[PDB]
Design a protein around this ligand. Structure first.
Ligand SMILES: [Cl-]
Length: 179
């Protein structure tokens, strides 16, 4: 079943089941392992993040960006292997209240309980076309932690247009296409 979403609400998330095809418009943030770890440590220390992850969408990706004028343009942004985040995704979800995760390869079955309890959906993005997916990036709003983490590990805030097809690979109802 196919959908296109602007703001992915919790109701939207509950409507989704594995096998569904999804296109995304609007705001997503990149977050790989090091950024997960940093964000977790900050929130554990009761620090504020310089961005709002509440009911947000994160993207397991290591983008390359370039400056055109005084503004960021996306060169490449494919999904990276989501299992790198298996040790931390549960805590990350509980501390941030994100609504969706976009990546590749899927994540451990043990997170199904968290996805179900918190209302999160895991979406598989196309692999092998990092440069092509950059075209779905309509605007690079912001980067955080660039100096500490470096470009692809930094948290990039993005506006994406018709980003997909993303396939619902793990839903909020106990299903995983990988099992
Ligand atoms: Cl990673």
């Amino acid at each position: 079943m196919e959908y296109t979403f602007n703001k992915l609400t919790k109701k939207d998330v509950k409507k989704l089941k594995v096998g569904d095809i999804v296109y995304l418009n609007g705001k997503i943030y990149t977050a790989r392992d090091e950024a997960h770890l940093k964000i977790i440590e900050m929130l554990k220390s009761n620090e504020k993040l310089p961005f709002d992850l509440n009911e947000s969408i994160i993207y397991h990706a290591g983008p390359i960006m370039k400056k055109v004028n005084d503004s960021w343009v996306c060169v490449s942004i494919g999904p990276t292997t989501s299992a790198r985040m298996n040790d931390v995704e549960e805590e990350f979800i509980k501390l941030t209240n994100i609504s969706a995760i976009v990546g590749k390869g899927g994540m451990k079955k043990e997170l199904l309980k968290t996805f179900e309890d918190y209302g999160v959906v895991y979406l598989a993005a196309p692999g092998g076309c990092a440069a092509l997916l950059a075209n779905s990036v309509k605007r690079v709003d912001n980067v955080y932690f660039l100096d500490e983490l470096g470009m692809p590990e930094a948290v990039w805030e993005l506006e994406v247009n018709n980003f997909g097809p993303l396939i619902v690979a793990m839903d909020s109802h106990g299903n995983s296409i990988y099992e």
